[PDB]
């Protein structure tokens, strides 16, 4: 009955699916930030499709390396980039090769076949499989036709990575208090103004500053009374 997601009760609902429900696993901000994957700025969607049953003894492995890349090496792509929508869906049927369907801001979806070589491991398998996307398939999205029209969308693409759940453990839960060790100058001057109906009167209390003001007469009345 404990509402485990009581902080995320206002966030959108992820695309709940069979192999896509690990978009609502509560990500520790220390497991994130352990994988900062920065995909080319012209990438719109990353899709992973694997199976539940496999027959070929290599197919049983290819559906595992693609499985892990969904668990580990896919949500950090969403959390960090925030313009890349990430969806890993398992198809409940026999198969050999899972897919990776990466879209681009032009509409140019490409092909990534998850073919791990026989003697690889599930750890090494992903690094070969992830590199084939992050470098070979995404950096080649720098061949866009009209490099402006495909940019104004990026400056229009609303942040897709809202649905994710990050548990900012001992890190701050607010973008500024997370930094907390970096001067910013990212502020927009209008936003910083207090507007609290007695600003420069509370503001002097917070930073504990008098403001060239004179002490109330009540102060010498008390000092006279704190004598001997």
């Amino acid at each position: 009955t404990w509402d485990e997601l009581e902080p995320f009760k206002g966030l959108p609902k992820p695309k709940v699916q069979f192999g896509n429900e690990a978009a609502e696993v509560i990500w520790p901000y220390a497991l994130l930030l352990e994988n900062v994957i920065k995909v080319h700025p012209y990438t719109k969607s990353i899709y992973v499709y694997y199976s539940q049953r496999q027959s070929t003894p290599l197919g049983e492995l290819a559906a595992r390396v693609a499985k892990r890349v969904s668990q580990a090496y896919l949500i950090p792509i969403t959390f960090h980039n925030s313009h890349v929508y990430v969806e890993a869906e398992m198809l409940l049927e026999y198969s050999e090769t899972p897919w990776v369907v990466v879209h681009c801001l032009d509409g140019t979806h490409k092909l990534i076949p998850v073919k791990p070589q026989a003697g690889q491991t599930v750890k090494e398998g992903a690094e070969e499989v992830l590199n084939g996307i992050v470098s070979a398939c995404n950096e080649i999205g720098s061949a866009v036709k009209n490099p402006k029209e495909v940019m104004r969308l990026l400056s229009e693409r609303p942040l897709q990575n809202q649905y994710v759940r990050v548990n900012y453990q001992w890190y701050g839960d607010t973008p500024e208090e997370r930094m907390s060790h970096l001067v910013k100058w990212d502020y927009e001057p209008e936003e910083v103004v207090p507007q609290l109906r007695n600003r420069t009167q509370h503001v002097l209390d917070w930073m504990n500053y008098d403001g060239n003001l004179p002490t109330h007469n009540s102060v010498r009345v008390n000092i006279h009374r704190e004598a001997a």
Partner: peptide, 22 residues
Amino acid sequence: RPPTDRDFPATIEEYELAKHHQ
């Protein structure tokens, strides 16, 4: 966004990026 990921360095310490001059 090439940079701005210098926060929490030992805990971060992870990147997948190569600098391009042009």
